[PDB]
Amino acid sequence: ARKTIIAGNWKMNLSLKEAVFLAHSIREKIPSISKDKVSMVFPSTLHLENVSKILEGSSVIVGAQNCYHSGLAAFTGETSPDQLKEIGVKVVMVGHSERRQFLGESNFFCNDKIRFLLKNEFTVLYCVGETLSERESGKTLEVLSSQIREGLKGIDSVFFSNLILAYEPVWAIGTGKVATPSQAQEVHSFIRKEISGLFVGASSISESISILYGGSVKPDNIQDLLKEKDIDGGLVGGASQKISSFAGLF
Amino acid sequence: ARKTIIAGNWKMNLSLKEAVFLAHSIREKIPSISKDKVSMVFPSTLHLENVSKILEGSSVIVGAQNCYHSGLAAFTGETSPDQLKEIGVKVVMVGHSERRQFLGESNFFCNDKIRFLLKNEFTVLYCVGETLSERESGKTLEVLSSQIREGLKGIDSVFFSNLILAYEPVWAIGTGKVATPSQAQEVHSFIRKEISGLFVGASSISESISILYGGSVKPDNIQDLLKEKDIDGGLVGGASQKISSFAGLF
């Protein structure tokens, strides 16, 4: 058993008025069409309280786009999991490409976040992915191996029921250049093996973990991705950010 | 006279329940006693929409603890000034010591944020200060000059009406070791001198810029700091986070 998950990442792309409309539209339309799939949305932190109240009691899960690895404390500009848990947000994204690249987040910083969140009973959506240059220099595996082994260092297998992974090759993020199903399937099968290999032969762990694909996922390409054996859903940026393309993914 | 500002930084120290209680108490209490002084508060991002609503139409200014240098766009986990303007937040802190040390913010990154915010008609509260080690080693002036010069690189005179500085020596942040009034004055005097030297005519604008002191400010020490010629207010951490100590600053 693996969950199929369609997650929307609103990034920093929406106004509050857009986010609020989107949430109301989502509550109205998605539960009835989601079927066996889990639906999830990651609004900007500034809108999370609002959107969390709108979606409360619905089957649509709300997650945060980032946090810091501390309970309430003196970290100017940061969001605490203590603050998220208070408003009922229990899923946090870690290691998104934009944070790696533009906010300089390393695999070690990711690991600190993941351990804190898993220890404190959060669910974590951890992003991994290579750049165009890494892919073109035959480094794809080295990068992804590193992201997984260093990101997930020191985490016992019992916490893996609360971990979700996303493969988002940087060359596909916002460029309109979606990985083909074979390309994505190849990478997902490698990732799944790495997860097994963390605990040595942990097939039950690796077969139970959802591994989502992201990077230019749209209504007209999602289905062929979801058909692949090791693709368990979509992490969706631009196309999650209007109700009509978001509903069109289900 | 330059304006006196008393600004509270709630960092990541408060629950929503606490932020709400504090915002209400502040609304009830501060406007009657602030008099000539500008009052300002910086809630955590997750709480800004709520606190902003609570304080809307009061004389208490709401500011954000950090943002990114872009309008709406694909930067997962970040907050846009577009999103802040929308809920009425028009003052943003840049370069707080916790972000420089724990989130790796450089002078140049700060300069990017300051330029973007000032260009977009925000008010910027730019934080400078040296560590204990830098102070002890003879680098106080080198560090502060650097932070000022690199931070304000390429900013036009036209925008200085919307710049506020805060000196927060890192050895005074949360340590209970406040700078003496002389120690603070001497560095404020230096900071103002640095501003005056940024370009021909600068001295004509440097007397207008508010320079606040921060680091272990409390009711029993604020008055003596404010008496100093180049100290134009306070940026207050811990003592701002409860109504009775915040009000005792006024």
Side-chain angles (χ1 to χ4, degrees), chain A residues 1-2 4-27 30-34 36-52 54-55 57-84 86-89 91-118 120-152 154-176 178-192 194-217 219-225 228 230-241 243-250, chain B residues 1-2 4-16 18-52 54-55 57-84 86-118 120 122-147 150-152 154-155 157-164 166-192 194-204 206-208 210-217 219-226 228 230-241 243-250:
Chain A
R2 284 218 266 290
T4 289
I5 304 175
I6 300 300
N9 179 3
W10 301 1
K11 317 191 167 187
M12 198 175 77
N13 284 112
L14 303 183
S15 74
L16 174 69
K17 178 185 171 59
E18 290 164 340
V20 165
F21 183 76
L22 185 57
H24 282 306
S25 308
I26 283 165
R27 195 193 170 99
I30 304 294
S32 77
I33 69 186
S34 65
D36 80 289
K37 308 188 167 66
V38 170
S39 54
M40 193 179 295
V41 305
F42 291 91
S44 294
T45 294
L46 192 75
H47 303 159
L48 271 171
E49 189 196 345
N50 201 323
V51 172
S52 195
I54 296 166
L55 295 171
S58 77
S59 67
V60 188
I61 296 162
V62 179
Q65 294 175 22
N66 185 41
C67 77
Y68 191 74
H69 46 82
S70 179
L72 302 177
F75 293 99
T76 291
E78 300 297 294
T79 303
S80 173
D82 293 4
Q83 296 171 319
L84 299 174
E86 184 183 8
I87 72 167
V89 170
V91 184
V92 182
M93 190 181 293
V94 177
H96 196 278
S97 174
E98 294 142 18
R99 299 208 63 78
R100 294 166 182 283
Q101 293 202 315
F102 295 99
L103 292 303
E105 297 201 359
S106 72
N107 293 326
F108 311 96
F109 194 36
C110 286
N111 183 245
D112 295 341
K113 292 178 186 194
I114 297 166
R115 295 210 51 199
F116 187 86
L117 278 160
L118 290 173
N120 289 294
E121 292 163 1
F122 288 73
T123 296
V124 169
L125 197 176
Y126 174 44
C127 302
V128 302
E130 87 297 346
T131 63
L132 188 55
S133 299
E134 290 161 350
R135 161 79 51 164
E136 288 191 335
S137 72
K139 305 286 172 216
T140 294
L141 301 187
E142 186 70 13
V143 170
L144 289 175
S145 198
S146 280
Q147 295 174 340
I148 292 172
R149 283 183 205 184
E150 305 177 345
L152 297 186
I155 304 176
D156 285 329
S157 54
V158 68
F159 291 107
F160 278 57
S161 55
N162 290 344
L163 185 63
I164 301 160
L165 302 177
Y167 172 52
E168 298 209 302
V170 185
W171 49 261
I173 290 176
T175 53
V178 71
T180 66
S182 310
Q183 290 180 319
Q185 165 65 21
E186 258 289 284
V187 163
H188 283 228
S189 77
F190 177 77
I191 290 167
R192 199 175 304 277
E194 284 286 308
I195 293 303
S196 200
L198 292 177
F199 306 99
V200 10
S203 63
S204 294
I205 302 292
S206 64
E207 287 296 305
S208 312
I209 194 163
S210 294
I211 306 176
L212 315 185
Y213 169 88
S216 305
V217 174
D220 64 7
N221 66 26
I222 189 154
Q223 300 301 153
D224 280 355
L225 287 158
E228 300 295 322
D230 292 301
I231 303 175
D232 311 310
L235 183 54
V236 192
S240 72
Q241 288 172 15
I243 182 60
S244 49
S245 49
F246 191 63
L249 307 160
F250 291 82
Chain B
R2 285 186 286 275
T4 297
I5 302 166
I6 297 291
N9 181 6
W10 304 358
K11 310 194 175 182
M12 190 182 74
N13 283 115
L14 306 185
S15 63
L16 177 56
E18 294 168 328
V20 170
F21 184 85
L22 183 62
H24 283 302
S25 305
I26 276 161
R27 190 166 180 156
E28 291 166 20
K29 250 81 162 273
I30 304 303
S32 289
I33 70 185
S34 49
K35 294 342 201 326
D36 14 91
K37 299 180 167 88
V38 176
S39 64
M40 190 175 291
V41 295
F42 292 84
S44 289
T45 293
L46 191 70
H47 300 160
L48 274 172
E49 187 197 355
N50 193 322
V51 173
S52 227
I54 294 173
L55 298 177
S58 82
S59 53
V60 191
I61 292 167
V62 184
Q65 284 175 34
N66 184 45
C67 66
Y68 196 69
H69 50 78
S70 167
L72 301 179
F75 294 98
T76 290
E78 294 298 291
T79 294
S80 181
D82 296 359
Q83 302 170 318
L84 294 172
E86 174 182 25
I87 60 161
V89 174
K90 297 312 309 300
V91 180
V92 178
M93 197 183 287
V94 181
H96 191 273
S97 173
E98 292 145 10
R99 304 205 59 78
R100 293 169 183 278
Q101 293 192 144
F102 293 106
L103 292 297
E105 297 201 357
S106 67
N107 290 329
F108 305 106
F109 196 46
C110 294
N111 177 251
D112 291 340
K113 293 181 170 173
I114 293 167
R115 297 200 66 173
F116 183 88
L117 287 156
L118 285 183
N120 291 294
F122 284 79
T123 294
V124 168
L125 205 182
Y126 180 35
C127 297
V128 295
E130 79 292 355
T131 65
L132 183 58
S133 170
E134 291 170 338
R135 171 169 278 247
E136 290 184 344
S137 306
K139 278 91 171 92
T140 298
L141 314 184
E142 288 182 23
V143 174
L144 293 171
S145 175
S146 268
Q147 290 177 338
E150 291 176 358
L152 306 177
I155 305 296
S157 23
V158 47
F159 298 120
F160 279 63
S161 46
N162 289 6
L163 186 61
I164 302 165
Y167 171 58
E168 304 206 302
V170 179
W171 45 263
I173 293 170
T175 53
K177 193 189 171 63
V178 65
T180 67
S182 336
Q183 284 176 325
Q185 172 52 21
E186 146 172 72
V187 170
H188 283 232
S189 185
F190 180 77
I191 294 184
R192 193 171 321 275
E194 286 290 307
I195 299 302
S196 82
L198 287 168
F199 42 82
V200 171
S203 322
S204 302
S206 60
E207 291 288 311
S208 73
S210 291
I211 304 168
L212 315 193
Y213 169 75
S216 303
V217 179
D220 72 1
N221 70 37
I222 198 177
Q223 296 319 317
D224 284 346
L225 291 154
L226 292 193
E228 292 297 325
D230 291 292
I231 298 184
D232 309 309
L235 182 56
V236 191
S240 79
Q241 298 173 7
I243 182 64
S244 56
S245 46
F246 190 59
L249 301 178
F250 287 91

